[PDB]
Amino acid sequence: MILDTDYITEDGKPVIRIFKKENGEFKIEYDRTFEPYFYALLKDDSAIEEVKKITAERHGTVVTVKRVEKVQKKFLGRPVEVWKLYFTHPQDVPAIRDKIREHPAVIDIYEYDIPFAKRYLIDKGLVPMEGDEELKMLAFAIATLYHEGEEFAEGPILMISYADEEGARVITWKNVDLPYVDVVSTEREMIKRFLRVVKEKDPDVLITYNGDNFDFAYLKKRCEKLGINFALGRDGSEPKIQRMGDRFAVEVKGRIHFDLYPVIRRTINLPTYTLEAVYEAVFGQPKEKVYAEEITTAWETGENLERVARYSMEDAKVTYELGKEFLPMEAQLSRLIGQSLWDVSRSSTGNLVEWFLLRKAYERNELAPNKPDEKELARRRQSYEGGYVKEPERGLWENIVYLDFRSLYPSIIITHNVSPDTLNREGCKEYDVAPQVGHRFCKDFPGFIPSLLGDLLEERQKIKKKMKATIDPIERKLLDYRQRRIKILANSYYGYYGYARARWYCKECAESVTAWGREYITMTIKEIEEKYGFKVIYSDTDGFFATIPGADAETVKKKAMEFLKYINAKLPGALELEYEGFYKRGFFVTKKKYAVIDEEGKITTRGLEIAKETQARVLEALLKDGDVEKAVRIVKEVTEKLSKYEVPPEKLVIHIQIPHVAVAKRLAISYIVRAIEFDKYDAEYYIENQVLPAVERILRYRKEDLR
DSSP states (O other), X not given: OEEEEEEXXXXXXXXXXXXXXXXXXXXXXXXXXXOOEEEEEESOTTTHHHHTTOOEEETTEEEOOOOEEEEEEEETTEEEEEEEEEOSSGGXXXXXXXXXXXXXXXXXXXXXXXXXXXXXXXHTTOOSSOSSOOOOEEEEEEEEOOOTTOXXXXXXXXXXXXXXXXXXXXXXXXXXXXXXXXXXXXXHHHHHHHXXXXXXXXXXXXXXXXXXXXXXXXXXXXXXXXXXXXXXXXXXXXXXXXXXXXXXXXXXXXXXEEXXXXXXXXXXOOSSOOXXXXXXXXXXXXXXXXXXXXXXXXTTTOXXXXXHHHXXXXXXXXXXXXXXXXXXXXXXXXXXXXXXXXXXXXOOHHHHHHHHHHHXXXXXXXXXXXXXXXHHHHHHHTOOOOOOOOOOOOSEEOSEEXXXXXXXXXXXXXXXXXXXXXXXXXXXXXXXXXXXXXXXXXXXXXOHHHHHHHHHHHHHHHHHHHHTTOOOHHHHHHHHHHHHHHHHHHHXXXXXXXXXXXXXXXXXXXXXXXXXXXXXXXXXXXXXXXXXXXXXXXXXTTEEEEEOTXXXXXXXXXXXXXXXXXXXXXXXXXXXXXXXXXXXXXXXXXXXXXXXXXXXXXXXXXXXXXXXXXXXXXXXXXXXXXXXXXXXXXXXXXXXXXXXXXXXXXXXXXXXXXXXTHHHHHTOOOBOOOOOOOOOOOOSSHHHHTTHIIIIITOOOOGGGGO
């Protein structure tokens, strides 16, 4: 399995090394054959003699142009004559490329900012994270001592917790008595112990949570403070720090630093991104949290070190449990994109497609356009973004079927050949004009993007076919993660067209897909009402709900299957409209806020929602019971229990802490009322101001009719 690629300079010559676990042992390959390059397009091949003598300077050693060959590539669907400029070392390119573009006879410069390490993977066709070998993993986290005002990492570390397969142990420094805790000498010996623990297992993945911005920076500052080489790279090197724009990143050479925070950030939307909230959002188990003030109160005194050590151990366990969950799906993404798991885990969705396009561009000899210059980069961000959802029909509806579009936006791209190269082509025999926006796209020749897109969907079906007829469940899990990965990549193409930093940027293509998306739904938002009964209630992009009014619960299903076979033969090729599921009593209030049922309970969704109890008492009556007023009639009967001071009050309690911080000033942490106590009347405001969202959000009669 290829883990990563980079280069070392040897005698001023670059040497690509391919870190790869082959069989059960780690291995380093070496390739001194490879050499960097970029392209130049010029007026006449006369000045190629003048441009070869363009020289720059790096480290007081003059930079030269090594060799040059003339190659032919198709750029914007038409072949071009560009020159492949070779050089000796990779860092020669940033020092001379602007001076070659500086030449008056050179028109433009191409493929000059691709990292040398990643360029090698593309041009050599080497796909990372391939094969059936298995990677050793170990998760570790550090818990330290904190004081305000003090600079970063001034205080020492208290215990390094590490979790591998076969258990989670904790190395420490003070004396705590637990079967999974190791004490030794000082803060220095515990590092050399942990550095010993790491190399003994020799893992391929060092799993961390927020390790790019906390753990490694903290470990490094104190290691140099105590004069110890932090040997973590399998070649004896120390973890390198990348700039990565705003925040920083850390890589361990020979291994894969898998920071969970960036990947958790991409796939989940949470109010706070703490390990405890992340652990239960992914697995459902609560996780106790020991704070920075409690951790700096136990060690300094020695009182109750039983919890400060056990919290770090659990931090290690869940970071391993999360990494073991999220890494297998992130490995197929790297094998799909063709970059290291390190590069892929910290990449935005748009840059994932960019890496994937550069790969396909090289195989198909497509010259890659350049990144935007800074003037046009600020010009692309001003672009108007417009997506609209028709307002949902209000009321209570039953016997509903939800119809869904099979990959609407990518299917629009392949059918109409939506691409920057086919855009406004000259002299073509057939065009497709987009609705309202009016862009033309040639159809005689397939575009670069739509050709690749069709090769992705027609590669996911061929994989979903193979998921069945495979017996090993872990093998079905491999194909399950890849097919689920192709869909995300394909759905990122429409967003890539609007991506500002994108190379294959085409705002004309993006507006067309939205217009075609709007045209195709509204065409089928009707066409079902005029010919098949069936008036629609809710309708977002790629999906709409519909039902026949006052029809049988089964007749709608039998009528829903008839319309599908009709428009599926009416729509173009890739446009497939599919059947998702059946629903009974359901209501819709403004776009994107809805709650329905199926046929056996279970609130299909909420998308909108003491009071935690009252709100669930409004939902079930509105859907399962389906009575009209009742829910309004019921909440009006909360004042009879709450404002009358006659409902069990010890639920008024807000068990959530960090009225605000005044009870802490009063207690110079559950509470209800500047009180704790309890066992004397409560407040006449919570009954309305805390149940208003339990009603007004869902109930849209008079909001004071419940008062």
